[PDB]
RNA sequence: CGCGACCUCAGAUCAGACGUGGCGACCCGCUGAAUUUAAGCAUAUUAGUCAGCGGAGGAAAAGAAACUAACCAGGAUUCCCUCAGUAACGGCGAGUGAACAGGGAAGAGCCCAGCGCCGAAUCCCCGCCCCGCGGCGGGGCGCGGGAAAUGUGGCGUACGGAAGACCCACUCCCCGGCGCCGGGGGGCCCAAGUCCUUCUGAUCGAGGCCCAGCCCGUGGACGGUGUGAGGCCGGUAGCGGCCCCCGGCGCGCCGGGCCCGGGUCUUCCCGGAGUCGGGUUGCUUGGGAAUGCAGCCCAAAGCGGGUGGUAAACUCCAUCUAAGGCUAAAUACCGGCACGAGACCGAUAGUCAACAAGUACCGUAAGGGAAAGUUGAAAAGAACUUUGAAGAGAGAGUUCAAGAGGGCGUGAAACCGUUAAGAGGUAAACGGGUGGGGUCCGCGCAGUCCGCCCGGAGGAUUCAACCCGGCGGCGCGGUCCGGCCGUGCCGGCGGGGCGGAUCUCCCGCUCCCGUCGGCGGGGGACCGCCCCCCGGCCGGCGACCGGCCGCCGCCGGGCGCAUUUCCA
RNA sequence: AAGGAGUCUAACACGUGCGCGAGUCGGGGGCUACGAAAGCCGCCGUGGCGCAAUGAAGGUGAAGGCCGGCGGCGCGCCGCCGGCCGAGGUGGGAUCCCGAGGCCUUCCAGUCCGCCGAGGGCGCACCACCGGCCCGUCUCGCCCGCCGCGCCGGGGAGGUGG
RNA sequence: AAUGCGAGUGCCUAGUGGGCCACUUUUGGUAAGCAGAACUGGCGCUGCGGGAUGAACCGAACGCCGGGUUAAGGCGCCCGA
RNA sequence: CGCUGGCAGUCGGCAGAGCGAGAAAGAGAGUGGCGCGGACGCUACGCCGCGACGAGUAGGAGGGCCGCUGCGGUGAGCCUUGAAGCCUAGGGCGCGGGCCCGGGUGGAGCCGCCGCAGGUGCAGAUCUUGGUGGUAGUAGCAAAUAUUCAAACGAGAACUUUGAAGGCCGAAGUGGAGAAGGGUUCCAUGUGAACAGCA
RNA sequence: CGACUCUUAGCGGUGGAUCACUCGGCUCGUGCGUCGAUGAAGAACGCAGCUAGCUGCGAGAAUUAAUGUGAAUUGCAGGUUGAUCAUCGACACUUCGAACGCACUUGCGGCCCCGGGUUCCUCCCGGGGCUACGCCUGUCUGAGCGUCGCU
């Protein structure tokens, strides 16, 4: 509050009186009488530089960078090591672009969703969410953030025929539409590699929303896939290629440590 | 997950409305489960507890196979006094040990004109939900 | 005290500007309120277009914009008189009218007259009594295909 | 003299109404500083801001041009972006500082006076009759009363309007009741474990619940319950149910009103005065030979008047119509009622106030204004014995725990008491270097294992090599067969979608006689790119492979009967 | 013992990271539990900044050279129509290009793959300089245009201010 | 010519703008641990060995250590010699 | 700090184990006269090798696996078979900021890593609030002449009560009544916790 | 040896830090957006079986009626044809206060109607209803050497 610490009437006693020249509370037969009113050092009082509502809370990000981050988060979800290093239990998942059929959207009971997650061998991630359900540490428990858990697999659908109601009671499961993909849910915590389960109608609209490198995006106005700074990134195969290896000097891998100087005299 | 924008998930608000609830709301709060014999008969899972109900403790020090009549339903400390759950003081006077209604299960209801209507309302609204599911 | 090199800046923060600070934290709240009011109005006028009355073809003054064309406030009385529409009946069938406008030219006048004719050809008029049709109104086969238009009526394109 | 009008003015505890005062976050009308900055200070700046005064509403105010402009012109007001820190003002210093155009949110227009025409055609009140009757209304009577010609009502208002005649065209607009047809508030209720073992003082903990992967899940938000609960309970989800009340959206009927328009000619009519404007003075503005406002003086006109951002004269243009009035929406809201939420604070913090807080207390007064949360799961809050006058103890008892005993969770430091150890005449304390004594630790007190080989005592269902089956790796299988891809390249009696400032049969509308020319609108052709079918090579399958074949490796099962192999 | 003092907003400069790139940016508006988030609009790019400067302003507004023919001046110049070449040079300059000759195994010729190298070149960025072009201003001057022949308009050479 | 050393260049930028002391030169003053200059080195900003003590003097500048040797100073005892 | 040093060559029965040496460059190709074996490495933001150097106020920069609080992710993290906090003659690590274990106390939540955010670190400000010392059992309980004996009540008597004295105020009183102001202080009984600066 | 003093540790005091809790704040957002002469806001005084404060209420005084709900309230006593809670639309609502008969002592009235008193005869007592200012329309009673008309 902007009136906090300033609702009192107080003026400094000045020099003399063997007191430290701070403003003091006016008169009265109470405890608050010459007790120190203004300033950050005093009990009660006003804090140094009070926080204001017109702080810049919000940041704006360029649309091309938001789309670029969406592409980087999506391309990292089809790689084994990157989704393993996010911790998702996908050792028995049959294919990493996990694409299912279009009758999954017609699910209306969560038993069908649980059975589908078991047949896709994805139920061990929901088990890890269940094992990771615990209480928070600190002041967040008294600020309506009492219980925490792990973000589970993300299910991506094209049209909603009941799939959000069928899947929304499972802890960890989140639902995103294809045309409304969120970076905050595709890469939780800023780290790429979340486990994703697609449907085929979901999977067949990515080339329409983002395009390939020769065909532009059809549902966006003018967006192309970004260009690669480095086409072949496997520098091991680059370096031990005969094209590079012949144009090198001999390796000087002999270690020449210091010599103890004996006196020749 | 709660989607109603007029229902609160605030911890302090829920604790305030629980601890400052009026007496007719405390009656619904202080409900007790029915036994599995009465559950299959009435198709009713839980009822608000009354003064003349026979009831059986399932949790705490006084849990067992013993069944006691409720002495009183003291809704101010959110607790009931049952017939034989009691404690000697220093001087020798016995006082009733209070048990919460959620840790005690009803074995015999006191059937009034209103509590039959409550069981019938609960049974009809359960069968409407069963018909909606089926 | 000035530094080595920089601008001479004149910040207008010498009054009590912190009292009159307008924050925009209710901007996503007013967008939803405007959208709900817009949809409530669109449901209130059910076969009438959601944008409202038709706006005329209007040139812009003031030479930076004299090549562009625009939606004006209303059709002029000369335009309605050439088109054959009464000025107190035009507002009842969704034609925007203002009497302040003049017609200096001929080409814009006849363009707005053609604009009125093409809208009058597209107007599907319901009977005043639903149980009994009238003379100057649409037949029953068009009222069942009559829908609500979204966006401005006959949008103005350069 | 008296009587009767009218005018002007009184008095009524006359009949019926209205105002006062409060709150005041947001709004309107005044009044109005000085701190401060200018490194002084006086103009300026602070600032038309704080303080002061009056008046409202759910918004207020503004608002349908005496406008912007100078264009191929826009067209009420309010708000947002931009114009723009710009034009401009300024001891031209410090500093101050708009508007138009443009894009949006919203969008709604209207009425008088005058001038005229209609028999004042208009309005209010009292008495009676019936109805409505909880926002005092409707029709019917009254030789009932007033207001009003010093002007009420209808038509009519700057977008022109009125009247007559000529033509064309209207049979349906509004309100009030009667009765009937499908959002808001309130009340009640609706899934599934207290299932078996086990820790605890208490479990909501842990383990399990087979092939319905314990049960429900459109319900795994939250809270309570003796720690940490989707399944104990209230709840939550659900275009879930049931029961009342209010309102909207409509239909039929009754009693009323209203007795209506458009177009072309003809004849008429048309505007707001101590106001505009001018001088001067003072404040104000970015407004600068005066932007706005106000006092005083002067004081209008009607092809008039105002504006056209440099004073003035002449001459053209352009644009409105001042001095009367109403009007929703978009916009504002630190007060009030009811709610929801939080990368906020966590009892010296956060409101002064988590608590009998604007309270205790102080000042004559205006005013000033605190401190103050926590036993336990449950008072089970310590019966009884004994000393003392008692406060206080000692036993006993409760509790998981009194090492939780009514300001009682945890219980730090400063300071103090006692015990133990060590020491002591250069105040104490300190840095470096040792020594001594303690306190505990190494769970020390016969002291590291590891690999290979040799020797000696043993024990296995055992090695190599072959056979069968499975799997994996590699393959320049120089170039095996088949697929897939290409930010690869050429072709086609190929089919298609986007784009183009590359071109051109019907169609709307337009100038001139169904003929004849420009332009709004779909094809059609051309070009570019992409997608899908066809053939060719190239290149990849190391972000992207299948079957046979060849080699190698590993596993399992046989056969190996022990100079092999392994084990201690 | 506890609390206790370079914070937040706006503006500017410079450096650094990212994306796109002569463009870039939806911040305002609109569409469609967390979510008041995210997504989308392109005839919503209005508008801001950048792509053009200079002058107080009216205004103006960023290479030329050679040749042929014609006209004038007395072989050169000016004006006038057609062709061809064409965005400057000097010095330094990372890097890159050529290569006289050569880098051994018994001995010489002898082709390919590399590696070095005397000397010679195209020269990035950047710096110094000399030229060139645009706007203001000054001086000296001679010409060209037509719808209005003029107190009209346009040009040249040499300094100088931005 | 000798000797030695890799240089050149562009942005942004804090703190400071009270100083003081010494050999030599030197102004005013009888003089001053006074006032005011030039040059270089210090103190300020800096510990260490010595001058008993010590801002400036002499020597010498500093990461934590072991061995050896020195500078300026010293070597009766304090107190190493 | 510099060498803008070295290492992708771990090139293995599809093998041949090297680039320290005074002297620009190739352990180059072709053309004619048994035993199935071989340490470590390489978080390339990593590892390794040579030299030289190390003062610091005001000030500037870098690195913190230093520390506090909250958020997004992540540890199939820890926890009533005992979390946070606090105490400790215990064992240690780090140059340091600090941190990890052991014992005790306590009774319900807490932490590591990758990023994000800030009301984020105290010895001072005659700092603010709260608490506690030395002084110190010290200064002091000294204005207005004065108390003594016996008895009663009581657990307890210098101070209460009663009686007997000796005294003072000495009618402008230390007497008897009112106004202002106070508001139950008046009266009766009981108590001796706190107050009545001894009781 | 002991006293006194210093250091460290154990235990006990003084003190209430730290931590963990939170029916409280702060901030943002939404919907509504409602006071009063029919007496507001505010204040005063009273009201409970035992009641000081807070809260609630107004002589019907920790509430009456009605409706919903359905067996309690509770610190101790006492006593389903509906205890208690909630809703609240009926009724009631002391004194001051714009505060209203005049004043602010809680004082003085005036008019009218009732009941005792009396037997309409005024006293006296008690009860009820009126008695403020400004202002609008109408009514009634008036004023004027204001302007007139007529006897
Ligand atoms: Mg505060
Ligand atoms: Mg903590
Ligand atoms: Mg500076
Ligand atoms: Mg009256
Ligand atoms: Mg004023
Ligand atoms: Mg000043
Ligand atoms: Mg100053
Ligand atoms: Mg001053
Ligand atoms: Mg004010
Ligand atoms: Mg008022
Ligand atoms: Mg109001
Ligand atoms: Mg208004
Ligand atoms: Mg405007
Ligand atoms: Mg600008
Ligand atoms: Mg000046
Ligand atoms: Mg100003
Ligand atoms: Mg505008
Ligand atoms: Mg619009
Ligand atoms: Mg009239
Ligand atoms: Mg008008
Ligand atoms: Mg719980
Ligand atoms: Mg379990
Ligand atoms: Mg739970
Ligand atoms: Mg479970
Ligand atoms: Mg349940
Ligand atoms: Mg339920
Ligand atoms: Mg619901
Ligand atoms: Mg005027
Ligand atoms: Mg003024
Ligand atoms: Mg001014
Ligand atoms: Mg003019
Ligand atoms: Mg002018
Ligand atoms: Mg007007
Ligand atoms: Mg007007
Ligand atoms: Mg108005
Ligand atoms: Mg929210
Ligand atoms: Mg506080
Ligand atoms: Mg605390
Ligand atoms: Mg405490
Ligand atoms: Mg304990
Ligand atoms: Mg305890
Ligand atoms: Mg607890
Ligand atoms: Mg304690
Ligand atoms: Mg001792
Ligand atoms: Mg602190
Ligand atoms: Mg930059
Ligand atoms: Mg000197
Ligand atoms: Mg120095
Ligand atoms: Mg020195
Ligand atoms: Mg000496
Ligand atoms: Mg040495
Ligand atoms: Mg000596
Ligand atoms: Mg250093
Ligand atoms: Mg210690
Ligand atoms: Mg914080
Ligand atoms: Mg401190
Ligand atoms: Mg003494
Ligand atoms: Mg007396
Ligand atoms: Mg007396
Ligand atoms: Mg005493
Ligand atoms: Mg001690
Ligand atoms: Mg009372
Ligand atoms: Mg009742
Ligand atoms: Mg009832
Ligand atoms: Mg008086």
Q: Which of residues 113-132 of B touch strand D (CB under 7 A)?
A: 118, 121-122, 125-126, 128-129, 132
Task: Return the SS3 of A109.
Answer: coil
Separation of C20 CA and D38 C1' (Å): 25
CB C46 within 8 A of CB C148: yes
Distance from CA of A59 to the nearest CA of C (A): 14
The secondary structure of chain B in percent helix, strand, coil, rounded to multiples of 5, reads: 35, 30, 35
Experimentally, the structure was elucidated by: cryo-EM
Task: Name the helix (H) or strand (E) containing A198.
Answer: strand A196-199
CA angle A134, A140, A144 (to 5 degrees): 90
What is the least distance, in Å, from the CA of A194 to any CA of chain C?
Answer: 30
* Distance (Å, whole) CA C79 – CA C108: 10
Q: How far apart are CA C111 and CA C101, in angstroms?
A: 15
3-state helix, strand, coil in chain A (%, to 5): 30, 10, 65
- Both tokens assigned to B40: 């299959």
CA-CA distance, C118 to A152, in Å (whole number)? 58
Q: What distances in angstroms separate CA A34 from CA A37, A41, A160, one per listed residue?
A: 8, 15, 68
Q: Which residue of chain C is at minimal alpha-carbon distance from A57? A: C25
Q: What does the block give as tokens for A234?
A: 């496997």
Reduced to 3 states (helix: H, G, I; strand: E, B; else coil), residue B113 is helix
On whether the CB atoms of residues A118 and A216 are closer than 8 A, the answer is no
CB B79 within 8 A of CB B32: no
Please name which of C21, C70, C73 lies closest in space to residue C52, comparing C-alpha atoms.
C73
| A66 neighbors A186 (Cβ within 8 angstroms) | no
State how far the Cα of A129 lies from the Cα of C50, in Å rounded to an integer: 49
Residue C74, judged by CB atoms within 10 A of its CB (0-12, 13-18, 19+), counts as buried
Buried-state track A104-139, b at ≥16 Cβ within 10 A, e below 16? bbebeeeebbbebbeebebbbbbebbeeeeeeeeee
State both tokens at C130: 């639903």
C-alpha to C-alpha distances, A187 to A74, A82, A144, A181, A195, nearest whole angstrom = 9, 11, 24, 11, 10
Which chains have at least 3 CB atom pairs separated by less than 8 Å from chain C? Answer: A
d(Cα A70, Cα A194) in Å, to the nearest integer?
12
B39 Cβ neighbours under 8 A, 6+ residues apart: B45
* Residue C77 CB in 7 A reach of strand D: yes
Contact A146 B11 (CB under 8 A): yes
Q: Tokens 């299960």 sit at which residue?
A: B105
Q: Which of A183, A193, A178 is nearest to A102 (CA)?
A: A178
Collapsing DSSP to helix, strand or coil, A17 comes out as: coil
What pairing do the DSSP bridges indicate for beta strands A23-25 and A10-12?
antiparallel
Which residues of chain B lie closer than 8 angstroms to A144, CB-CB?
9-11
How far apart are alpha carbons A129 and A152 in whole angstroms? 6
């Amino acid at each position: 509050s902007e009136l906090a610490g300033h609702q009192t009437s107080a003026e400094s006693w000045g020099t003399g009186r063997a007191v430290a020249r701070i403003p003091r509370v006016r008169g009265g037969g109470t405890h608050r009488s010459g007790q120190g009113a203004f300033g950050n050092m005093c009990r009660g009082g006003r804090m140094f530089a009070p926080t204001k509502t017109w702080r810049r809370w919000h940041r704006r990000v360029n649309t091309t960078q938001k789309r670029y981050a969406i592409c980087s988060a999506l391309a990292a979800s089809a790689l084994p090591a990157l989704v393993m290093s996010k911790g998702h239990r996908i050792e028995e998942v049959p294919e990493l672009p996990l694409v299912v059929e279009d009758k999954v959207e017609g699910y209306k009971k969560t038993k069908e969703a649980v059975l589908l997650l078991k047949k896709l061998k994805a139920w061990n991630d929901i088990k890890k969410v269940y094992a990771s359900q615990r209480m928070r540490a600190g002041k967040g428990k008294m600020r309506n953030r009492r219980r925490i858990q792990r973000r589970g697999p993300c299910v991506i659908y094209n049209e909603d025929n009941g799939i959000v109601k069928a899947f929304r009671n499972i802890p960890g499961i989140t639902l995103l539409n294809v045309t409304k993909l969120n970076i905050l849910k595709l890469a939780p915590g800023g780290h790429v590699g979340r486990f994703c389960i697609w449907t085929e109608s979901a999977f067949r609209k990515l080339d329409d929303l983002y395009g390939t490198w020769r065909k532009a995006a059809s549902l966006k106005s003018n967006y192309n896939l970004p260009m690669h700074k480095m086409l072949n990134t496997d520098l091991s195969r680059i370096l031990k290629s005969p094209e590079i290896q012949r144009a090198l000097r001999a390796p000087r891998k002999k270690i020449h440590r210091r010599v103890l100087k004996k006196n020749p005299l | 997950m709660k989607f109603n924008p007029f229902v609160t998930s605030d911890r302090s608000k829920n604790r305030k409305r629980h601890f400052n609830a009026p007496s007719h709301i405390r009656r619904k709060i202080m409900s007790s489960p029915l036994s599995k014999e009465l559950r299959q008969k009435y198709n009713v899972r839980s009822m608000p507890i009354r003064k003349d109900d026979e009831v059986q403790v399932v949790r705490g020090h006084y849990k067992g196979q013993q069944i006691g009549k409720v002495v009183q339903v003291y809704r101010k400390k959110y607790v009931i006094y049952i017939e034989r759950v009691q404690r000697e003081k220093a001087n020798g006077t016995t006082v009733h040990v209070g048990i919460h209604p959620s840790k005690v299960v009803i074995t015999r209801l006191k059937l009034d004109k209103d509590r039959k209507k409550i069981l019938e309302r609960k049974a009809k609204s359960r069968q409407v939900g069963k018909e909606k599911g089926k | 005290a000035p530094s080595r090199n920089g601008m001479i800046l004149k910040p207008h923060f010498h009054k009590d500007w912190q009292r009159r600070v307008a924050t925009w934290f209710n901007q996503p709240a007013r967008k939803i309120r405007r959208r709900k009011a817009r949809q409530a109005r669109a449901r209130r006028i059910a076969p009438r277009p959601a944008a409202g009355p038709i706006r005329p073809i209007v040139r812009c003054p003031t030479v930076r914009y004299h090549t562009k064309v625009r939606a004006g406030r209303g059709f002029s009385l000369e335009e309605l008189r050439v088109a054959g529409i009464h000025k107190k009946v035009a507002r009842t069938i969704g034609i925007s009218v203002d009497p302040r406008r003049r017609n200096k030219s001929t080409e814009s006048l006849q363009a707005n007259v053609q604009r009125l004719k093409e809208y009058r050809s597209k107007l599907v008029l319901f009977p005043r009594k639903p149980s009994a049709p009238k003379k100057g109104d649409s037949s029953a086969e068009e009222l069942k295909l009559a829908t609500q238009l979204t966006g401005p009526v006959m949008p103005i394109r350069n």
